[PDB]
Design a protein around this ligand. Sequence first.
Ligand SMILES: NC(N)=NCCCCCNC(=O)[C@H](Cc1ccccc1)NC(=O)c1ccc2[nH]c(=O)cc(O)c2c1
Length: 236
Amino acid sequence: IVGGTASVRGEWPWQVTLHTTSPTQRHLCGGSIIGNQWILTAAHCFYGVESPKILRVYSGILNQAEIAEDTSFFGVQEIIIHDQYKMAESGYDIALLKLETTVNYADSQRPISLPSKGDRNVIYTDCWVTGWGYRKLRDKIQNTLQKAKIPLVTNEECQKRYRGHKITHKMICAGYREGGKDACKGDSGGPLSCKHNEVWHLVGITSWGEGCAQRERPGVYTNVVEYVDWILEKTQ
Ligand SMILES: NC(N)=NCCCCCNC(=O)[C@H](Cc1ccccc1)NC(=O)c1ccc2[nH]c(=O)cc(O)c2c1
């Protein structure tokens, strides 16, 4: 996260850090608890991942330093990638991880609500992006989970900023005209969480963009409301 601040422990209890153990253990991508056996994340995170056996999901984490060889984690039983996914920039950048055991919910870890189809007309004014990603284009994974408040931008506005791409209605964009606050490398797969009528909704999944926090280059997110049928289908 560029231009963000350290999170409070437990304030983003749906946020997970997905690790790979190969060749040695490291943070791979963000994701969101959406059900007791289910993490929603980006499809592009699994480029070259051959098997779910190399993955570890850690929940209830604030600091990456909490994670050591003796720290408990959730195994991944299955990776489910949208069958129309080819790459982040063309959409369908969404994936489910089916965990090998179920998450026991607590103040430190619990699921985020998916948006309703009735909320397509909602004007979210309180949206946040979170993660352990870079604080600038050339940087490293951060110890402490970062957060930034970022306003949504209209698709028509977003399309003007990415003339070489097609910004579809299955995408949603967010950014300051002047830049300065954004997701960056290592944040991908994580949530764009919006608070509306005192409830947090998983509005986006961090997907792609040009550089990080550049002026007139908003972040592009998978538009989660357009996938509620797919999520239901794939999780039932
Ligand atoms: N909103 C804006 N402006 N851009 C949107 C930002 C989201 C895309 C950025 N890419 C990303 O976030 C890659 C996506 C990716 C993941 C896995 C494999 C390939 C690509 N992530 C990374 O480049 C990435 C992921 C995990 C990492 N772990 C480490 O220990 C060190 C790293 O340098 C590192 C880098």
